[PDB]
Structure formats: structure tokens, C-alpha cells
């Protein structure tokens, strides 16, 4: 991501200081088809980062939910006072989050 954001700004900046020359030499389409490519590479880098972070969250949340089940069943069929059932349930739920 940090590697695909430096060029995407630089290009814009260039096309901002040289408008008279750029619009004279009539190379507009050659530059637009480059702005599009730069911005698309940057967007795909960001999208893959966001998908990876969400992937991690989904997997770890399912692991936490499995913990929730294996804690509730352990506390249900066991020999313990109700204080350590209520505390256990609540804390095992927060651990998941």
C-alpha cells in the first residue's frame, strides 16, 4: 500500500504544474490512460489489504465462538458453584469479542 500511494500522488502533482505544456503537446489520452492504471493498481492494493484484515477477523471470531461453545458445555455439566458459571459464561463471551 505504501508503495502504491507515492506514485499516485506524484503523477497528479506533475500534471498540475505543467498544464500549458501538457495541454499544448496534445498528449492528453496518453496521460489519462496512465492515471487510470496508477489509480487502479493503488485501489487493488488497498482492497486486498481490507480483505485480508476482514479475513483475519472472521477466522478469529469463529475460533472465539468455538471457545464459547466449549466453555458453556464444560460449565453446564460440571461440579461448580453458580458464581463461577455466571462469571465463566460472561468472561468467555467477552474473550470472543
Amino acid at each position: 500500500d505504501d508503495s502504491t500511494q507515492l506514485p499516485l500522488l506524484c503523477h497528479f502533482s506533475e500534471t498540475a504544474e505543467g498544464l500549458t505544456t501538457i495541454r499544448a503537446f496534445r498528449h492528453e489520452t496518453r496521460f489519462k490512460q496512465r492515471m487510470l492504471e496508477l489509480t487502479d493498481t493503488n485501489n487493488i492494493a488497498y482492497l486486498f489489504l481490507s480483505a485480508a484484515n476482514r479475513w483475519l477477523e472472521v477466522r478469529t471470531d469463529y475460533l472465539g465462538a468455538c471457545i464459547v461453545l466449549t466453555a458453556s458445555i464444560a460449565s453446564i455439566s460440571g461440579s461448580s458453584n453458580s458464581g463461577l458459571v455466571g462469571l465463566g459464561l460472561l468472561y468467555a463471551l467477552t474473550i470472543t469479542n
Binding site: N81, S82, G83, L84, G86, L87, L90, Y91
Partner: protein, 101 residues
């Protein structure tokens, strides 16, 4: 530079040691002590609430002598709040001093 098979897979964990005890050595143990105390108090208030709640599960008729449970809950909650206020200040002080040095 062959980091991926070998360098990347292990965390730096050595520059990290320098960062942890960076501003000195007495600005770290304060953070560790305050963190552990705050976390233990934050668990203990709920533990006490559970014990008080559980001790009267059967005593349906008389909800009396509830001054001890209330006193315990209030004192533990106040102490926990104080430790919570302390710990963050300790951590931020450590970070600021480490950055300065």
C-alpha cells in the same frame, strides 16, 4: 535479501527490547506494576459481584444485611477506577520520555 524464508518469519524482538526499557529502567516496572494491578482489580469487581449474587440464591424470604455486599462492591469498584486512571497515565509517560531520549 533472503528475509522471507528466514528474517521475516521471526519478529525483531531485539529492537523491541531496547524500546521497552528505553527512557531508562524505572519507567518500565512502574508500567508493568500498574497494568497488572489495574487488570486484577477490574476482574475482582466482577468476581465480588458474582460471589455476592450467588450467596443469596436460596435466601428467598429475607434480603437483609445487604450493607456488606454493597460496601464490598463499592470499595472494589472505586479502587478499580483509581487503578484504571493510574495505568494509562503511566504508559503515556513512559512513551513520552522514551521518545525524548
Amino acid at each position: 535479501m533472503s528475509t522471507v524464508m528466514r528474517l521475516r518469519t521471526k519478529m525483531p524482538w531485539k529492537t523491541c527490547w531496547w524500546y521497552l526499557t528505553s527512557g531508562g529502567f524505572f519507567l518500565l516496572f512502574l508500567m508493568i506494576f500498574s497494568k497488572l494491578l489495574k487488570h486484577s482489580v477490574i476482574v475482582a469487581i466482577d468476581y465480588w459481584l458474582a460471589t455476592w449474587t450467588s450467596e443469596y440464591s436460596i435466601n428467598d424470604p429475607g434480603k437483609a444485611d445487604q450493607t456488606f455486599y454493597v460496601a464490598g462492591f463499592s470499595i472494589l469498584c472505586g479502587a478499580g477506577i483509581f487503578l484504571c486512571l493510574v495505568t494509562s497515565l503511566t504508559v503515556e509517560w513512559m512513551g513520552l520520555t522514551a521518545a525524548k531520549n
